[PDB]
Amino acid sequence: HWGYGKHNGPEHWHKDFPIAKGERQSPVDIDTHTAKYDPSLKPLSVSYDQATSLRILNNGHAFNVEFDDSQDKAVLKGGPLDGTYRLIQFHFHWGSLDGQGSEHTVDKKKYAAELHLVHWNTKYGDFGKAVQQPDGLAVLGIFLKVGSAKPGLQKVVDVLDSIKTKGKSADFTNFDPRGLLPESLDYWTYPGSLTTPPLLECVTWIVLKEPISVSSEQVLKFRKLNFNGEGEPEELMVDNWRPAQPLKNRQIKASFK
Ligand SMILES: OC[C@H]1O[C@@H](O)[C@H](O)[C@@H](O)[C@@H]1O
Ligand SMILES: OC[C@H]1O[C@@H](O)[C@H](O)[C@@H](O)[C@@H]1O
Ligand SMILES: OC[C@H]1O[C@H](O)[C@H](O)[C@@H](O)[C@@H]1O
Ligand SMILES: NS(=O)(=O)c1cccc(F)c1
Ligand SMILES: [Zn+2]
Predict the structure, then answer these.
(1) What's the gap in Å between 218 CA and the centre of ligand 3?
(2) So where are the chain's domains?
(3) For residue 13, what are the CA distances in angstroms to 16, 20, 60, 134?
(4) 174, 176, 180, 221: residue to mutate for ligand 3 pocket, most atoms within 8 A of CB
(5) Which positions are catalytic?
């Protein structure tokens, strides 16, 4: 099964998911000097005040915080997006050390981790139909650097001991994802893909320029999770990131002059 190890990691994925070598794969390096300000991008609207979180799950690759997406609540609109995209889950990618962990890079810089808030285009009715469409998904990506603690992350940190191994879940109601955002919504955007199998080319990426700061202790607790299930040999859940992929025939646009 796919994973991040030497024998099943990103360099192997193409054998079962040939789109891994496709024309709009993610992540990419964001060259900040070649990214061009796009005056046509509409204002971005992150509207999370009515979000309904439900559960946190260790899926053997990362942990997902899942949201009720049965009606318009937490939604992402504007920017490059045509229509309304509903929040379904967020998760992170992170490293074994603070010097790596992000999927996107900024002028080749790797951050300690990267948060992905995943949304699907409501015109397609359900996530499964959305991932059959070129404009089915929008992922809001946020870099994490290590410094001061992020208060809005601590509830996540503090529940991880209850979902240590693959297949474990816990109730995670009444969590406010607004506490994970930076101050500024300046962003870069480009068309890409899921960064894990099945690597589907359905995503409008919106990557915020301003990182959030998290404490060393917060990210260290991410690294205590396990890729394996209960009773199996312990494999620490670290380095669950895909490296940057070829930009090919794409341009990265900036929301800011
Ligand atoms: O409890 C987390 C969040 O859930 C939302 O549904 C509420 O409207 C917010 O006020 C609250 O902060
Ligand atoms: O032909 C000129 C156009 O080239 C495109 O590649 C750029 O995205 C546009 O910003 C530019 O106006
Ligand atoms: O908001 C997410 C979670 O935070 C804390 O773990 C609370 O104890 C729990 O009740 C809540 O579900
Ligand atoms: N890492 S990611 O591209 O955000 C992603 C991968 C797979 C499924 C999904 F909903 C989101
Ligand atoms: Zn992701």
Answers:
(1) 16
(2) 1-257
(3) 6, 7, 16, 21
(4) 174
(5) 61
